């Protein structure tokens, strides 16, 4: 109204979250997949507690990786190929393995 | 009040709770601050006389 600019509207980011784990007996490690989002928005919303759900304790370490289905937090990328244990999407595969 | 009528299909009104059933003795062990027990689906399962 004030300047007769034309402005678009679009929604704030949303999606599903799902948890990747090896067996509980083997270890308590987890990796989190945020589906169909660019990591810049979720990292800039984890910091300063803008995301929800809000864990009491967690951290995004240096391990952040981008995939077509979304981006994984807490998983380390590797430049080698193996047979799939847990399929993620778009060709990205996961497993629990030695460093 | 009335006496109890165990092992027969009867109407029962123990304490504001109503239904029909077969009363039998039990081996529950209530704490002194618990008067009722419940199963899943919120059905009453046992009562303290």
């Amino acid at each position: 109204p004030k300047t007769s600019e034309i402005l678009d509207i679009s929604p704030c980011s949303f999606g599903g979250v799902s948890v990747i784990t090896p067996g509980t007996n083997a270890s308590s490690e987890v990796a989190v997949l945020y589906q169909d989002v660019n990591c810049t928005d979720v990292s800039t919303a984890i910091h300063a507690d803008q995301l929800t759900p809000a864990w009491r304790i967690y951290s995004t370490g240096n391990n952040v990786f981008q995939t077509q289905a979304g981006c994984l937090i807490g998983a380390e990328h590797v430049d080698t190929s193996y047979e799939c244990d847990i399929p993620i999407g778009a060709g990205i595969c996961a497993s629990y393995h030695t460093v | 009040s009335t006496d109890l009528i165990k092992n027969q299909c009867v109407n029962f009104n123990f304490n504001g709770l109503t239904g029909t059933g077969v009363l039998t003795p039990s081996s529950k062990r209530f704490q002194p601050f618990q008067q009722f027990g419940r199963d899943v689906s919120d059905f009453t399962d046992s009562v303290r006389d």
Partner: protein, 50 residues
């Protein structure tokens, strides 16, 4: 026949199909039971209470 017997003695995953059948049926019944506790906007979930 010996090697197949040892495999069956130690494996757990080989029968996942039959296990999935059992789990599917049990989960379905569990859900149908749990629905009784819902309220559907009634003043209470307990029929005899009302």
């Amino acid at each position: 026949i010996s090697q197949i017997q040892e495999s069956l003695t130690t494996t757990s995953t080989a029968l996942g199909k039959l296990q999935d059948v059992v789990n599917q049926n049990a989960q379905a019944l569990n859900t149908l039971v749990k629905q009784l506790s819902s309220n559907f906007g009634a003043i209470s979930s307990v029929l005899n209470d009302i």
